[PDB]
């Protein structure tokens, strides 16, 4: 479909919200590609995904190398 | 809504259009400026999707890989 997405592997929570949201940093497929790293807020069932951003492993080492 | 990037951290990496995906220190409507990764224009004055982190968010992130 116009586009699919799954969790492979969840790594950490940085954060949750009153109404159950959380903001996790997650290895996610999205159309069928390799896993990336993703930074984005999840509802509790993780159904809904908000607003994120999706890092290649060379740009989250870069960021992790960085800081 | 308004906005301002108060300070430039790191370009991740930029595309054929010359749009980059930064981390920056932005400011939404007035209030703390907050980390913020997305795409950006060149000229910056359009940005794609992205997400914001507090402070504690974004210390805790980097806390767990390294």
Redesign the interface.
């Known amino acids: 479909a116009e586009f699919t997405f799954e969790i492979e592997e969840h790594?950490?929570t940085?954060?949750e919200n009153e109404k159950g949201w959380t903001?996790e940093?997650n290895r996610v497929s999205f159309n069928g590609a390799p896993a990336k790293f993703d930074?984005?807020?999840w509802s509790p069932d993780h159904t809904k995904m908000?607003?994120?951003?999706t890092?290649?492993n060379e740009?989250?080492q870069?960021?992790?190398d960085?800081?």
């Not at 908000?50 to 951003?53: N, P, S, V």
Request: charged letters at 20%.
């Open positions: 790594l950490l940085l954060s903001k940093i930074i984005r807020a908000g607003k994120g951003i890092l290649s740009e989250f870069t960021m992790v960085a800081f």
